[PDB]
Symmetry: C2
Amino acid sequence: YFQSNAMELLKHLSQRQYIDGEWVESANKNTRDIINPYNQEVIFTVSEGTKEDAERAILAARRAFESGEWSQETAETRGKKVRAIADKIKEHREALARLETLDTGKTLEESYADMDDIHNVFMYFAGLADKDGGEMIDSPIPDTESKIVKEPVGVVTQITPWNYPLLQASWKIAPALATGCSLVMKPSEITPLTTIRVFELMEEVGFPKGTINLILGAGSEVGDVMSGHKEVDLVSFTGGIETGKHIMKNAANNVTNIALELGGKNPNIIFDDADFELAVDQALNGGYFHAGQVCSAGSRILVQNSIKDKFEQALIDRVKKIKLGNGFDADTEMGPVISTEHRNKIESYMDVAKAEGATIAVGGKRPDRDDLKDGLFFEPTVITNCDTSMRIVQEEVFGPVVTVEGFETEQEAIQLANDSIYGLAGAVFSKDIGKAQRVANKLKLGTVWINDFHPYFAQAPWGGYKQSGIGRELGKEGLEEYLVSKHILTNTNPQLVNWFSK
Amino acid sequence: YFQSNAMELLKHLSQRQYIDGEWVESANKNTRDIINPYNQEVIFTVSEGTKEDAERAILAARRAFESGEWSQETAETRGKKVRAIADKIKEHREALARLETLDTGKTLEESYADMDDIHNVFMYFAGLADKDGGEMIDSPIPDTESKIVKEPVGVVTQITPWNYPLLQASWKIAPALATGCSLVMKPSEITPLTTIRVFELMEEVGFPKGTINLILGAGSEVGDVMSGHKEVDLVSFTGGIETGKHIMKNAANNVTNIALELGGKNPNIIFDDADFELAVDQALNGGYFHAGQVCSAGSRILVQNSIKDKFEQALIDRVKKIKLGNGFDADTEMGPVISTEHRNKIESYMDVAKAEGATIAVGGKRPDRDDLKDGLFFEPTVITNCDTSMRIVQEEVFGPVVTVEGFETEQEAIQLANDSIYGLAGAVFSKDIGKAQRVANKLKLGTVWINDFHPYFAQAPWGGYKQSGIGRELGKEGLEEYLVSKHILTNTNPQLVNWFSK
Ligand SMILES: [Cl-]
Ligand SMILES: [Cl-]
Ligand SMILES: [Mg+2]
Ligand SMILES: [Mg+2]
Ligand SMILES: [Mg+2]
Ligand SMILES: [Mg+2]
Ligand SMILES: [Mg+2]
Ligand SMILES: [Mg+2]
């Protein structure tokens, strides 16, 4: 009784926003219904905040920041509180995993793995909090002392996507809290459940009023307030490229720093000297984990011409066996897509593939099976006889869809892999490790996997080249987005200059 | 015969742009006359480039970058070439100083000090080039190797201001070349002379075609191309806040990284326990070095009420003795302002001070003396009986003008100093070093001087909090703006996952 228990969890979950230490409704009492993508049933109703609520949260975050209660707390103590959040995630791993599956549709196994990652993100940043306060500089001016002090950047606004909501939240919350910033977070309007829950958990730990704030929904001009308010010091946005560009333009009005992660067209490069069985397995894993909606998805398969036919038929044969179903059922290998609008977007992209002349080798429709009929399912799809000039190869579909292109040589694989506007992540499969390393050094991607697909972890920075984003999350670089440098120069033997006549 | 020799230097200076290894005119043959602010005489005529020229330069920079001739050169070798530029600056220190004085009006002594700084900027980055290639990560996944590799960011566009043209150029050129980027630089249309000269010097050293490019002027949409072209990876702009905001909005269209330095309203905080003589000297130095046009200028004096009257009368008495004149004359302490438009801007700000009710205690007009009549001079000015609500206190005037406000307590000094939209630099004067350190830690400024005014140097990062900018120049942080991180993860014992049914 996995799903019905998860449903009973909801009877204890807050429905409200969290602003300045209090759970509160929307200023105009508006609500929004949240859906289970497996059966499209409404599972919960939450507040839908207004732009005045967002304004209020940002002003509270500012007041808290200036008060120093969190920003001037010792780094060691901030780290202890971030660890306490980590430990709460582990304590509540089952419930959180179940809530994530209910809200997003992914398999329970995927959700459990995700909860383990999230615990490790918090634990990583807890440990990093007190490890680097700045630098002493060897001043070139005699009788001076020069130091660089790291300070928290201030008030941060954090906007997360519907694909891996709590995971993306953790990437933003952990460094903000570790550094002493105040934050205002707004999860996707579609998938707020686990974010609400993590806010309840953070309240249990206890932070100064205003240090953490949660805004819910997609209210009119809320996004604009979060990117454009004069009191914001950093906007951290993960989501679609068009929204990201708008956010950056908004941020310019007050000279606000931005960190953006905007998607990808991630290549999966398979040489003829790859372990063949491995490359087929990982092409499946690349394409279809979380129904191709995880940000690391490998939608663009590039395979060496010599084995392309062999590869295509192996991949297609496997794709026909993929088990679709309820994320709570153990035999499910792939769940539904996230929303009606997203499935429609995916369907309109298949309109494009057809208008461009590509072949849908398998999939490309909604499944008919009775038990899948009420849910937001779409068949795992393989598109063949496509080329780099096509919209279906160039544009991010964010669904259970891969394209397959051939290449003759190493140089052509690199040129094709780099021929998109994006640059987030990708893989190279070859037993020739030297070759794989040559390719990796030429790919304009923030993360390159050699003989693997998907890995990310707190210890290493993640983010895009090209139009995939600005900045990095995770690792030390991720922490650094939340800090500002101040050079304090002291003249220890000050003398008159006497430039101007006396 | 200092000035006439500097004028004869010009008979050997290029008049053209430098694009893809060649000195070239503007695509439409347009030119612009360059003026000596001391006497408003036209001293030189240079090409005025078109937006198609800028496009061509950026495409050449891209082609050069992709070729690897500079980007894949060893860091050690790149450092050697950056050192060779440094050594050229020192070799030509006199000529460059004289050219800077001719073009910008500042005293020869100021220009010599500047040439020494510029040599040290290049030398610093030459030494930094080969010191950090990335990191090895302790991977949390068994049988994996994780490394982070630093790569140059790519094609950079660099736009510099008319206040300290070669110095600002050096801050941008040195890290770009040290990291292996290709660059396209466009100096202020008003003051191109020393930038043209440094390009001649860099050509003497020798770089691959397309690695360095120089665009001249303020042609229609040239700025827009430099901030908005798809092939740019970083825009580094130093100049006015309104242009900077436009640049950032442009950059958003292609998800282009930005580094901005946008001015300041730099406070000079003088406690009653300061060394009084020192504080008067440094208030003069803060306000009037380069006629208040250097980016470190201290236009906003905050003085403790107990000594405010004493301070005001000491400052005013000194301001009346400041020697205005030709930058080439040894007895000159302050030169002219940079342009007709800038002097007019300064004059319209005095219209504001008057409309707001402040007192012009000294100065506030153009000098009448016969030898100053043809030049762009403006008297050093002290404005009193002003408060933080006034436009003359809040807005950047960028001229030989200071305002004087009083404060009662340490807390009030901090609150007033922080009450502007800016956050570039400022000073605290007090013999109570502990107090000065408390104040420094509360000021939202990128650089805080304790008992000094003006110091900046290659070893320490420089840049703004708040609307003074995004990013940092100088130091390691300055280098880092020109680098991108790539995580290469290798699975050294790859295994099938077998998530999907066989
Ligand atoms: Cl090959
Ligand atoms: Cl005091
Ligand atoms: Mg409870
Ligand atoms: Mg020493
Ligand atoms: Mg800002
Ligand atoms: Mg010559
Ligand atoms: Mg080991
Ligand atoms: Mg970019």
